[PDB]
Amino acid sequence: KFNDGNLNIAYAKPTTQSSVDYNGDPNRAVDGNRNGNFNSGSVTHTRADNPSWWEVDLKKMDKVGLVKIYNRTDAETQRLSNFDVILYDNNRNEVAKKHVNNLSGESVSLDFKEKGARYIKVKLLTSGVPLSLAEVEVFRE
Ligand SMILES: [Ca+2]
Numbered sequence: 001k002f003n004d005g006n007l008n009i010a011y012a013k014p015t016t017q018s019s020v021d022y023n024g025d026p027n028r029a030v031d032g033n034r035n036g037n038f039n040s041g042s043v044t045h046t047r048a049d050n051p052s053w054w055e056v057d058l059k060k061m062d063k064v065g066l067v068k069i070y071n072r073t074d075a076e077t078q079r080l081s082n083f084d085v086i087l088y089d090n091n092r093n094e095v096a097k098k099h100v101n102n103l104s105g106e107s108v109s110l111d112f113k114e115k116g117a118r119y120i121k122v123k124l125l126t127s128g129v130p131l132s133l134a135e136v137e138v139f140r141e
Pocket of ligand 1: 028029030031032033034035042043133134135
């Protein structure tokens with residue numbers, strides 16, 4: 001629930017994703033654990049979808065500052081590349097979007113500058129690539 005004194009509003013929020021493989025259910029990216037080893041149980045996994053995506057529902061409109069996305073680390077780390085992070089309002093209108101080409105480290109941090117949104121979606125833009133996320137943390141500033 002807090003990370004380095006900052007309230008992670010994504011923690012334990014409802015999630016969904018495009019599909020599930022290897023029991024990589026979407027709630028694994030809001031389980032409070034940043035571990036990126038798939039075999040730990042901390043990491044999501046879809047099938048090879050067109051495209052693969054994951055989403056957290058904050059349950060109401062809230063304010064989105066920092067979004068920190070933690071990749072899988074044990075293998076296939078390149079799969080988290082060429083992807084959008086999209087904010088949606090209560091009517092599922094897109095209110096902001098950032099594109100991430102790839103990660104040089106284990107995570108990427110995006111700042112949505114307090115944009116009002118209820119849903120945050122991570123969407124791969126490459127067909128037929130599974131999406132795996134170790135964790136997605138969302139802060140209000
Ligand atoms: Ca996790």
